[PDB]
Structure 1
Amino acid sequence: EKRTLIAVIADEDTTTGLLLAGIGQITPETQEKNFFVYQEGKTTKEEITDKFNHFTEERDDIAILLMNQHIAENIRARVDSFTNAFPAILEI
């Protein structure tokens, strides 16, 4: 389909491992980034929510949004209210 890419909302260590596996890297043709780093005490709930809606409603090439469970817990009502077919949200 059109939806081929994985997006990432993840703490520092998970992002590091994902970027080593090539996940969340820049899409060559569009130059878009496919990751946002959560930093406890720095990132607000509003920024997490904004990045969520971006990867989820403002991008159209995302098949799967990966997030740490604890980050999904921080915005659980926004996550539980997501209803679209795509992307699939997987909590890691």
Structure 2
Amino acid sequence: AEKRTLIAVIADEDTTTGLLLAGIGQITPETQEKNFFVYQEGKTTKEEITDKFNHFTEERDDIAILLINQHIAENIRARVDSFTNAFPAILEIPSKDHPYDPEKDSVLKRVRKLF
């Protein structure tokens, strides 16, 4: 159970900034590696998001819940779908100025088939 109490973020810069101010993530004091990843839309390559994905899910283990923007999650669709674990939780929420889509939501796809 308890061995994890950070919420990590893959989101647009404003959303992330806000979330941190509110206090969820951190820049660790003995790894000196962020436990959040900011994204400049369209200006950041799809390959850099993927490294960061691996980082929160696997290369870190203190991540409880992994938050991820629908716009961003779609770009790296392959890696998200392949992640099916509950440790950390994958919870896709709408991106900033983007509406809900059931098909940018990895878990909802999974659930629908084989009900």
TM-score class, shorter? 0.7 to 0.9
CA deviations over 1:28-69 (Å, ceiling 9, x no partner): 565542111111232111100000001111001111111111
Secondary structure at 1:91 match in 2:
strand
Structure 1 unaligned regions, length at least 5: none
Give the TM-score, by structure 1 length: 0.87
Secondary structure at 2:58 match in 1:
helix
Secondary structure at 2:23 match in 1:
coil
Aligned residues with identical type, % of pairs: 99
Secondary structure at 2:4 match in 1:
coil
What's the RMSD between the two structures over aligned residues?
1.6
Secondary structure at 1:19 match in 2:
helix
Q: Which has the higher contact order (CA 8 A, sep 6+)?
A: 1
Partners of 1:32 and 1:64 in 2: CA distance: 18
Structure 2 unaligned regions, length at least 5: 94-115
Post-superposition offset of 1:81? 1.0
Partners of 1:71 and 1:41 in 2: CA distance: 9
What is the number of residues matched between the two proteins?
A: 92
Partners of 1:41 and 1:87 in 2: CA distance: 26
Name which of structure 1's ranges 31-40 and 56-65 shifts more when overlaid on structure 2: 31-40
CA deviations over 1:52-89 (Å, ceiling 9, x no partner): 00111100111111111111111122111102231001
Partners of 1:52 and 1:61 in 2: CA distance: 14
Partners of 1:63 and 1:76 in 2: CA distance: 21
CA deviations over 1:3-36 (Å, ceiling 9, x no partner): 2211111101111211121122224565542111
In structure 1, the partner of 2:79 is: 78
Partners of 2:33 and 2:13 in 1: CA distance: 19
Partners of 1:58 and 1:46 in 2: CA distance: 17
Give the TM-score, by structure 2 length: 0.71
Task: Choose 1 or 2 for highest CA Rg.
Answer: 2
